[PDB]
Amino acid sequence: SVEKTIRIGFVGSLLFGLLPRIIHLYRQAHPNLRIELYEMGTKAQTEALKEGRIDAGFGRLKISDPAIKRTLLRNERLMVAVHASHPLNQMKDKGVHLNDLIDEKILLYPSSPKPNFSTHVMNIFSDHGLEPTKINEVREVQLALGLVAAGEGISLVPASTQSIQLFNLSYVPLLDPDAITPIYIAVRNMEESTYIYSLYETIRQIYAYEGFTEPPNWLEHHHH
Amino acid sequence: KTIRIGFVGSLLFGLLPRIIHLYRQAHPNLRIELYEMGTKAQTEALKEGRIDAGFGRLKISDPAIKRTLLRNERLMVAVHASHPLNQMKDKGVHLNDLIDEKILLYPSSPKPNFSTHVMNIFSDHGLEPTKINEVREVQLALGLVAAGEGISLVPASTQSIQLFNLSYVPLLDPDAITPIYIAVRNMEESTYIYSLYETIRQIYAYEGFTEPPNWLEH
Ligand code: NA
């Protein structure tokens, strides 16, 4: 039965955060439902939603398209991943600011088409008249972390990346209040299905276990 | 003043980064270029002079290449916290305990690869898991295991990734392992590569690993 299927797209690195918990609870509440999961970048999720290849997309930025709509789930703090012997690691307990990083070799990611996660990272530098002088782009966050640990530079990464711990890799807090990164759930620009409204309530439940406080105008409910 | 090193991505969770870092610090005049690539690509790149050393998990013999086994890394089973296999002591389980589970193999790139190696270890003992799905890379398998979708066989160094309600269970079969090799051109005798060998030896000595006679020495 094609009607009893829900297909979900997601950026791969979100598996380091709350997404697996959400999927686990969703499956527990829906043993009847065939749930299919597809890794894809935020840009690619738009075309997949428009074409009906997926029904909801977990992404890391807003890319405006009239066929799609979205809800901001939350913002994650950014950390600076450094080698433990880097001078910046002496500020591990308290943190650093974006302006401390301008002359460092920074590893951006992913390498998938623009805009992507790295676009916002470069924007927050520009927003404050900061011009990083040494940038390299790598394939994905786990490669960036391994390179940092090998001595290749530093990288700005979501806080949930701390699920990965490597010898002599250290995560330093980034103190600028706008040094954060968004998580969105995107769907077709139409009324959500029963199954998608059910996914929204699963997210609400997981976020409540995590102690987050939701605004009034957050995830929409079904109306008459 | 430039050495080029190729490596399979999974090795970033183990000792390779600290090896490269110690090597880097001992050679301030040398440029280190690191390239993520599979074993097939490493072999051809070595032959053509595009990389100088390759780190991988597969040894197919080639007359133009010399490979040295660094160590055998243990395999483990990634399972969800409440899984019955996660109830079986601080001892472990055997491969034959896994045959009726949904197993997540990876990567989905061209073979030979880690999935064919895993399936070979099963077939080596007349075990034929029927509930198999192939995914892109290790993080996808782990995330799906944490989501409750199945189990996955992974290298021990994968424990660098820790996810909510994901547990790693030891395997008891002696051949439940995955090797790590360094590959160079069979001709090779560069001082920079001999020094790379020295660095591997130092770190392994500190870990207390590999002590066969003339291992990377001459
Ligand atoms: Na289900």
* Structural domains of chain A, ranges and CATH numbers in brackets: 1-75+183-224 (3.40.190.10), 76-182 (3.40.190.10)
A182: cis peptide before it, omega within 30°? no
Q: What is the DSSP string of A81-135?
A: EEETTSGGGGGTTT-B-GGGSTTS-EEE---SSSSSHHHHHHHHHHTTT---S-E
Sign of CA dihedral B47, B53, B59, B64: positive
Q: By C-alpha distance, which of B19, B12, B204 is closest to A81? A: B12
Half-sphere exposure (Cβ direction) of A121: Cα atoms closer than 13 Å: 25
Chain A closest CA to B161's CA: distance in Å? 5
Give CA separation, A218 vs A75, A184, A208, B11, B68, in Å: 13, 12, 13, 42, 57
User: Which resolution, in Å, applies to this structure?
Assistant: 2.0
For residues B140 and B74, the answer to whether their CB atoms sit within 8 Å is no
Name every residue whose Cβ is closer than 8 Å to that of residue A214 and which is 6 or more positions away in sequence.
A204, A207, A208
- Coil, helix or strand at residue A43: helix
Q: Is B72 exposed, middle or buried (0-12, 13-18, 19+ CB in 10 A)?
A: middle
Note the helical H segments in chain A: 19-29, 42-51, 117-126, 141-150, 194-209
Q: How far apart are CA B158 and CA B79, in angstroms?
A: 13
d(CA A196, CA B82): 27
Tell if the CB–CB gap between B36 and A163 is shorter than 8 Å: no
Among B18, B24, B25, the residue with its CB nearest the CB of A167 is B18
Amino acid (one-letter) located at B72: N
Ligand 1 mean position, distance from CA A34 (Å): 5
Identity of residue B17: P
Choose the mutation target among A24, A26, A86 for the interface with B, i.e. most B CBs under 10 Å: A24
C-beta of residue A85 within 8 angstroms of C-beta of residue A65:
no
The two tokens of residue B125 are 């003992």
Is residue A58 annotated as involved in ligand binding? yes
Token code pair at residue A205: 């439940």
Q: Are A149 and A84 in contact (CB under 8 A)?
A: no
Please state, as a whole number, how many other Cβ atoms lie within 10 Å of the Cβ of residue A17: 21
Q: Which two tokens stand for residue A6?
A: 């829900």
Which of B139, B168, B196 has the highest number of chain A CBs within 10 A, making it the mutation to test binding with A? Answer: B139
Q: Which of A33, A35, A44 is nearest to A10 (CA)?
A: A44
Determine whether the interchain pair A165/B162 forms a contact, defined as Cβ–Cβ distance below 8 Å: yes
**Single-letter residue type at A176:** D
Phi and psi based region of residue A13 (left: phi greater than 0; alpha: psi -120 to 50; beta: remaining): alpha
